Amino acid sequence: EEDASQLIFPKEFETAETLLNSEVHMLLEHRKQQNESAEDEQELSEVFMKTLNYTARFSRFKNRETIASVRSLLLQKKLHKFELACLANLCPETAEESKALIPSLEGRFEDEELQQILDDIQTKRS
Amino acid sequence: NMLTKETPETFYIGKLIICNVTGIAHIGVKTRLDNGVTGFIPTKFLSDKVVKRPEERVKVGMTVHCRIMKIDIEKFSADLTCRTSDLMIAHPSFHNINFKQAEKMMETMDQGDVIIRPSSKGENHLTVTWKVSDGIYQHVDVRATLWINSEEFEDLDEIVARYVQPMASFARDLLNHKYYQDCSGGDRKKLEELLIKTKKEKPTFIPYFICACKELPGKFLLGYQPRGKPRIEYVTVTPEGFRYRGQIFPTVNGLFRWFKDHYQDPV
Amino acid sequence: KRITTPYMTKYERARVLGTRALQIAMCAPVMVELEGETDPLLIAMKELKARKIPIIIRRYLPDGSYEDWGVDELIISD
Amino acid sequence: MFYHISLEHEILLHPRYFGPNLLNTVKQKLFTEVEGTCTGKYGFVIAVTTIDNIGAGVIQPGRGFVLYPVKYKAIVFRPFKGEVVDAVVTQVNKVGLFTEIGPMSCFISRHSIPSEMEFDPNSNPPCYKTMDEDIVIQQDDEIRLKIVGTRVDKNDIFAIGSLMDDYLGLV
Amino acid sequence: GATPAYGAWSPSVGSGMTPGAAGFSPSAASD
């Protein structure tokens, strides 16, 4: 029954806080910077390294202010939290591609209304 | 190579090869190696030719590590060297020691020479001892609960220059005081009679003295005689300055200047 | 706004002494200088006399509320 | 998908750890206990960012062990069905494709892949191309996919991908 | 250990009464 396509999740996960690829990337980078210092400490594990090299290959923007602006210009809408991560991470070109990938956008908003948002997201990319 | 399975090509010079000495024919100790090679240690490996066989340099019956300087697995030879060498003002010192024995090397250095040594209470702890006076030494047991971080463990060249050097200078400032005395480490029984023996010679003028205790280092004794009754008042020397009546002064002279204007009250 | 008695009952004193003795027997740091003894129970008694036991008692009330009292806060009976 | 939620956990601390570094020891134990593990309720956990507070240690009766119900603010990665993410291809085999969704590895079969992407066993690097040889997909390429299934192999998540929906390849 | 904390001790101050007059020596300059 758990299918994110139809916007359904358990009660505990419904009250979660979404994270973007750049956000998690910078969080892990800061954690690594803090951990590497303060000698006599247990070093990072393979999980941290794989997550780092996985999120580093999808960092659409390095500036934190870019993350702040792209979340601010998005939260003003009426979309759910789930629509804040996938759409901000994939960064599709045209509205048709976004509507095809995410079935929730089908009929939820107009065409130009989503195309302008996609163009803004593309421009915000570094 | 077909039988032993260990040719001289594998064993190189300089690499330490264990030569298990199990027996000796005449003078040396000819034993077996790890790879089934007859390791014959000549008299040169042990330094014994016309004397008792080398037992301290070559382990008889067991395996003794030595520098491998000969590949003679096929020839039933093992040029393993039995010798260990073959295998191959403000003076902060160091110590890679107990407490009773450490005191034997503290009375020679002059004031200001700080020495760092491990602790003897727990783990990952250190104790900084700095020369205070003749026989008085403060053993700051850093976990004198001096709270610090862990990054300082790498470089220890600033903990003494940030908390010991200024404190040491302030403590030494009192050593050169005009009215200074020791009285056998400043005992409570000997420092009281002096106050009553010195007042009779000058009842009008009430002088003062300063001394540091021996059982509790870091607590000076500033006594005075307001009347015919003695009184004692301790004072602590903090890293930044002093701690008299709860106040902390920046300079050493500040405490003296503030003390000569507050002892007139009836108390 | 604690309304419980400011004295340590015998039950609480006994339980605290026993718990501190058990902790000391399990290689825990002491809170008083040892004069040359080894029995953990004696060390616990000495700490209680010195008022240095790192334990706080939670007296539950009938209604459901509770009050946290520290060994170094209330008066000891014995 | 990565998320930031508030979790809770308790750890017993042996009495030998009592002392001025009690809180530091509790934090150190917490760090090396709830990092990298996985559970079927909240999913795979990456690491811990910060800790909210330290609960009151309730000493157990007749035992020196004391438990601290700490509540830490850590992140979690719990992928669901239907989500679309961007991963990287790790290996190409005739049986199927292998990818790496961060702390998880999925797998897509040839049946899911359209008939246009054929095999290239003759060439040294295993790759899939079309008749015209215009589009090329190989390893170390940011290729998207769809999570159509989930699985937890005893705290080891292993989902399954798919390649039927359009617009799934080079961006 | 046989080397307990020495700087952590609380210096207790002694109380008393001495109704004396003001006839002691003056102060000095801090320079």
Curated annotation (Swiss-Prot), chain B:
Ubiquitously expressed. The modification Phosphotyrosine is found at residue 263. Residues 27-83 form the S1 motif domain. It is found in: Nucleus. It comes from the Eukaryota. Residues 89-179 form the SH2 domain. Interacts with RNA polymerase II and the DRB sensitivity-inducing factor complex (DSIF complex), which is composed of SUPT5H and SUPT4H1. Interacts with KDM6A. Interacts (via SH2 domain) with SETD1A. Interacts (via SH2 domain) with POLR2A phosphorylated at 'Ser-2'. Interacts with IWS1, AICDA and PAAF1. Interacts with histone H2B and H3. Interacts with WDR43. Histone H3-H4 chaperone that plays a key role in the regulation of transcription elongation and mRNA processing. Enhances the transcription elongation by RNA polymerase II (RNAPII) and is also required for the efficient activation of transcriptional elongation by the HIV-1 nuclear transcriptional activator, Tat. Besides chaperoning histones in transcription, acts to transport and splice mRNA by forming a complex with IWS1 and the C-terminal domain (CTD) of the RNAPII subunit RPB1 (POLR2A). Belongs to the SPT6 family. This is Transcription elongation factor SPT6. It comes from Homo sapiens (Human). The gene is SUPT6H.
